[PDB]
């Protein structure tokens, strides 16, 4: 029977930052958009970082001048394009616009719907 004694167990450590903080949501300081602050979350902690909050979330399109179009004129199959004239309704942008302006559209048509035919081009043979 040989007895003895020798035990060991060194070690123990933990903590440090979250390592590579991941963020995405940006907060605007000015209110609508601009240079502000940002709060990011990693695992189960929060962080602060400076970012830019540019305006470009919602959108649709842009206008210029509005007119009152009635009924497209007659299309000329010879040019496969129609012409018309619209009267200026009101100024919403106050930009440069004439009281009246013409328009164009890719329309084509020929041989009007007029009355023709007489008992089958009359008799014959």
Instruction: Answer whether 72's CB lies under 8 Å from 84's CB.
Output: yes
Q: Which residues contact 57 (CB under 8 A, 6 or more apart)?
A: none
Give backbone dihedrals phi and psi of 81, rounded to 5 degrees, phi first. Answer: -150, 140
What is the DSSP-derived secondary structure letter of residue 119? T
R_g of the chain, CA atoms, integer Å: 39
And the tokens for 99?
């009281």
Distance CA 32, CA 13 (A): 45
What is the DSSP-derived secondary structure letter of residue 97? -
Distance CA 53, CA 104 (A): 42
What 3-state class would DSSP assign to 50?
A: strand
**Residue 4 CA from chain centroid, whole number:** 80
Distance CA 17, CA 10 (A): 24
Last residue before each gap in the chain (C to N over 2.5 A): none
Is the C-alpha dihedral spanning 82, 87, 88, 89 positive or negative?
negative
Distance CA 85, CA 69 (A): 7
Domains of the chain with bracketed CATH: 1-57 (2.20.60.10), 58-125 (no CATH)
Residue 43 C-beta-side C-alpha neighbours within 13 Å: 7
Collect contacts of 13-19 with beta carbons under 8 A, ≥24 apart: 18/42, 18/43, 18/45, 18/47
Distance CA 120, CA 125 (A): 13
- Report the Cα–Cα distance between both ends of the chain, in Å, rounded: 139
């Amino acid at each position: 029977g040989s007895k003895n004694k020798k035990e060991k167990n060194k070690g123990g450590k933990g903590g440090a930052d979250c390592a590579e903080w991941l963020y995405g949501s940006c907060v605007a300081n000015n209110g609508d958009c601009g240079q502000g602050m940002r709060e990011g979350t990693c695992n189960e902690q929060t962080r602060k970082v400076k970012c830019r909050v540019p305006c470009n979330w919602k959108k649709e399109f842009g206008a210029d001048c509005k007119y009152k179009f009635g009924n497209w004129g007659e299309c000329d199959a010879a040019t496969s394009t129609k012409s018309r004239t619209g009267t200026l309704q009101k100024a919403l942008f106050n930009v440069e616009c004439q009281q009246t302006v013409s328009v164009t559209k890719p329309c084509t048509t020929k041989v009007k719907n007029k009355p023709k035919g007489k008992k089958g081009k009359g008799k014959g043979n």
